[PDB]
Write a protein that binds this DNA or RNA. Structure first.
Lengths: 98, 248, 135, 62, 91
RNA sequence: GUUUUUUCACUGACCCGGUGAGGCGGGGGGGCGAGCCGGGCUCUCGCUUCUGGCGCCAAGCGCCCGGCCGGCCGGGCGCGAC
RNA sequence: CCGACUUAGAACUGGUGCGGACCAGGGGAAUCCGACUGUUUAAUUAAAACAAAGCAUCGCGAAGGCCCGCGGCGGGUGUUG
RNA sequence: GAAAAUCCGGGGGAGAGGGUGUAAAUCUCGCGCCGGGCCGUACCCAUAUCCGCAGCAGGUCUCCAAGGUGAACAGCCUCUGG
RNA sequence: CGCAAGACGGACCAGAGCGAAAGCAUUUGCCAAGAAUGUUUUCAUUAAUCAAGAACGAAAGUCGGAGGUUCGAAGACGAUC
């Protein structure tokens, strides 16, 4: 179910609120606003274990995206690369349900 | 009556290696308890260029298991090894690249490099750029392993001896044609005084057994006896066959 | 959920007191006009108590087990939060944001933190907090 | 940053507070790589406790 | 505009060295001077420092690669092959 | 029996390699798979692989012993590390 | 209001003289040789000779190939494979 | 696309200091006190102090570098100096 | 009896299937594609055929690297003549 999680993110970019980037997503986890965090496979290992530990305390689900930041940013419909994506509200999407 | 250039090469003095900027000896880590009974972990500090050598060398920094000192090693860097990677090494190490475990304890068809020929000599075989050796078969009676070498010679090896997994880095540099004599000048200037190769036929008959003649010819067969003495041993030394090498 | 609460143990990430374990006493998670960024007033331990051993003199044990505390405001991203918590009073009056404008108030909040940190070190509770982070 | 860019035998003359910055690994390691090694020294040390707790819970049914 | 019809990087060698040796050198010369996508950060910054040694300008992470290319065709087959021997040894 | 001779393997001259000659070889103790109704055998393994931290100069527990006035003040020795 | 170097175009003008000295490639059509740059007989030969990249043979898996040394558990290639 | 002398920063925390003082150990802060030996040092450095038998049209490693013309450290003319 | 190497995928294999053609046959996995059928889905003429232009294109052949079991242009011989 990888062709799905692309199509779910495309529905979050339209409907939902989200935070692309690490520094900005680290602040949404910390303020208990992030309901899902999505990491690229090639994020720094110290920042994978940073996000995984902040989401431990905030009790947020951490997804690990199939591809890299160039591939993650494409699924977020952006023309730049993103290693950390925190979703505030899914809007009208089924990303946190499944 | 003059000594030939090859005899002059043995003395050294001018034909010695250019080892001023050569960044140490590319040795595989020494055998100890933590290579023999299990594994020891080191970090890859930096992949680094060595003058005269084609393969890049990897500064790998282990921690001394007896002292509070830290031990830096110079491995022949395996293709795909990177900096801030952990290199493991020992009998209970895992079979992925840049990771030096003994040859007995890895399966058949395993590509290795910087392979020890006699156990505990810190890595001798298949440690030129791009080269690899395959482990073919094991022999738990006698504790021995046939390993195919880059030449094509299958050589029996004592199973207890070690090799970084994968091919050596800097591979395929012989595919590029050096366009110009200056690029050849610059190559051998980092190695030793061997390069601008004067052919013996162009020399005089006092310096070389091929020299002299009112035409530039050899006049004796270029193929020569293995037993031949130093000064005559010139041309194709103990040539089994010669000419355009047809078939396999 | 929202996890930067006034009990939480926190690694001070930047500044002079880098790699020091600090108790949050207040958390202003939507910053004021003076500090727009989301900040927290922490009380931490600058000099940790030294490793103390059986068959040391009770006078030597006393000298080893001496905390030097610090009271400081940080950004949330000059702090590394942890799951650990030190349930230590550190009263709102003496340890406060009104404590930096006077140097004499600061020395009291540093002294308030010191005596309170020292008493819970000796009980053996929260002894992860009183170990220095090895980095 | 915060340390004088001067010839190395001059550092005898210089005062202590010229040659370092007031921090752990101060004027030996940059702030970026100190805060990335306070986290590493913590999060590696945290993952050891999860592995320690999963270890003794894998014992109890055998 | 397009400057040269069929030479590229190897227009710098003028008429020297032969057409075939200039052609053979071209395929290498493009690859060794090409910037590649850093597998670690995704930034098109893997530039060849020396032979076999590639360096991300942004990560400051060095990789021991091929002479003229980042990956050698062989070492990509070996990494695949070593990983499958690894899946059989580990069971 | 005496002695020649070929083939196996022996180490102890002789040789090579490594190392700061740092855990070799046996035996003991402890772990799991395998086995007969609390017992023991035929065996096995020996603590570190998610991260570009830290790691030495002993903790602990035994065992002895030197003032003041049994209760307050310091060393040695084992085991830990068979 | 401060401008600092040029460029193009025009008029007029001199006994057609003007890159006025200085500086400063004769050209073309062909043959032979060596691809080229490089090198060479200091003091009669700068060449078509040598070198060169490319090409192709050969030896050698180290107790090894090649080589040195009166000698050695010697030495060079070799900080090599 | 050098080594080493040399110098510094840091991680650690064995120790050390004194019982509220005439504070103590300790200070890479500011001042003050004392010392620094031995050897070379002139001049030529080149159409005349060097090497070519010589005040030899040869050779012999560097540094500084005005105005005009001009692409120019070209040539040609000029100032300082000679 | 073993061992090694490189080819090839018999029988099943059909006037059967698939693909634009060239072509495509051991197992299993992965990748994206596709016709046909089914359709009370959707858009609503978006289509057909096409100078220039473009993708693919058996075998042989050429170029560089690895390999070379069998067959085998050239070549050598034995026959036949």
């Amino acid at each position: 179910s990888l062709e799905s999680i692309n199509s779910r993110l495309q529905l979050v970019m339209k409907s939902g609120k989200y935070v692309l980037g690490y520094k900005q997503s680290l602040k949404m986890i910390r303020q208990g606003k992030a309901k899902l965090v999505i990491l690229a496979n090639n994020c720094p290992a110290l920042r994978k274990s940073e996000i995984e530990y902040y989401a431990m305390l905030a009790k947020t689900g951490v997804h690990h995206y199939s591809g890299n930041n160039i591939e993650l940013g494409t699924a977020c419909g952006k023309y730049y690369r993103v290693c950390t994506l925190s979703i505030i509200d899914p809007g009208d999407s089924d990303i946190i349900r499944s | 009556g003059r000594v030939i250039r090859g005899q002059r090469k043995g003395a050294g003095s001018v034909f010695r290696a250019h080892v001023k900027h050569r960044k140490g000896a590319a040795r595989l880590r020494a055998v100890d308890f933590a290579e023999r009974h299990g594994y020891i972990k080191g970090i890859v500090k930096d992949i680094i260029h060595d003058p005269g050598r084609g393969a890049p060398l990897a500064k790998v920094v282990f921690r001394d298991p007896y002292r509070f000192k830290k031990r830096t090693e110079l491995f022949i860097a395996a293709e795909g090894i990177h900096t801030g990677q952990f290199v493991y090494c020992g009998k209970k190490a895992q079979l992925n690249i840049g990771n030096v475990l003994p040859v007995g304890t890895m399966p058949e068809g395993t590509i290795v490099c910087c392979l020890e020929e006699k156990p505990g000599d810190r890595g001798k075989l298949a440690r030129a750029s791009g080269n690899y050796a395959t482990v073919i078969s094991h022999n738990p009676e006698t504790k021995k392993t046939r390993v195919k070498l880059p030449s094509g010679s299958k050589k029996v090896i004592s199973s207890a001896n070690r090799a970084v997994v994968g091919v050596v880095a800097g591979g395929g540099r012989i595919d590029k044609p050096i366009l110009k004599a200056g690029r050849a000048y610059h190559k051998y200037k980092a190695k030793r005084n061997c390069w601008p190769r004067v052919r013996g036929v162009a020399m005089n008959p006092v310096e070389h057994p091929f020299g002299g003649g009112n035409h530039q010819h050899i006049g004796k067969p270029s193929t020569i006896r293995r037993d031949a003495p130093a000064g005559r041993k010139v041309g194709l030394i103990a040539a089994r066959r010669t000419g355009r090498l047809r078939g396999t | 959920g929202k996890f930067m609460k006034p009990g939480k143990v926190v690694l001070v990430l930047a500044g002079r007191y880098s790699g020091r374990k600090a108790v949050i006493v207040k958390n202003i998670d939507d910053g004021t006009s003076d500090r727009p960024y989301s900040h927290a007033l922490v009380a931490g331990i600058d000099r940790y108590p030294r490793k103390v051993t059986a068959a040391m003199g009770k006078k030597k044990i006393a000298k080893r087990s001496k905390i030097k505390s610090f009271v400081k405001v940080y950004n949330y991203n000059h702090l590394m939060p942890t799951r650990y918590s030190v349930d230590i009073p550190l009263d709102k009056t003496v340890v406060n944001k009104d404590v930096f404008r006077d140097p004499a108030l600061k020395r009291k909040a540093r002294r308030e933190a010191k005596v309170k940190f020292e008493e819970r070190y000796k009980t053996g509770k929260n002894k992860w907090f009183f170990q220095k982070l090895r980095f | 940053r915060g340390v004088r860019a001067v010839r190395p035998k001059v550092l005898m003359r210089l005062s202590k507070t010229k040659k370092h910055v007031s921090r752990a690994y101060g004027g030996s390691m940059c702030a970026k790589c100190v805060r990335d090694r306070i986290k590493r020294a913590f999060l590696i040390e945290e993952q050891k406790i999860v592995v320690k707790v999963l270890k003794a819970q894998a014992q109890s049914q055998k | 505009a397009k400057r040269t019809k069929k030479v590229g990087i190897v227009g710098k060698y003028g008429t020297r060295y032969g057409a075939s040796l200039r052609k053979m050198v071209k395929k290498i010369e493009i690859s060794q001077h090409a910037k590649y996508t850093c597998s670690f950060c995704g930034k098109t910054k893997m530039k060849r420092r020396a032979v076999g040694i590639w360096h991300c300008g942004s990560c400051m992470k060095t990789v021991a690669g091929g002479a003229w290319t980042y990956n050698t065709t062989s070492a990509v087959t070996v990494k695949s092959a070593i990983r499958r021997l690894k899946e059989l040894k580990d069971q």
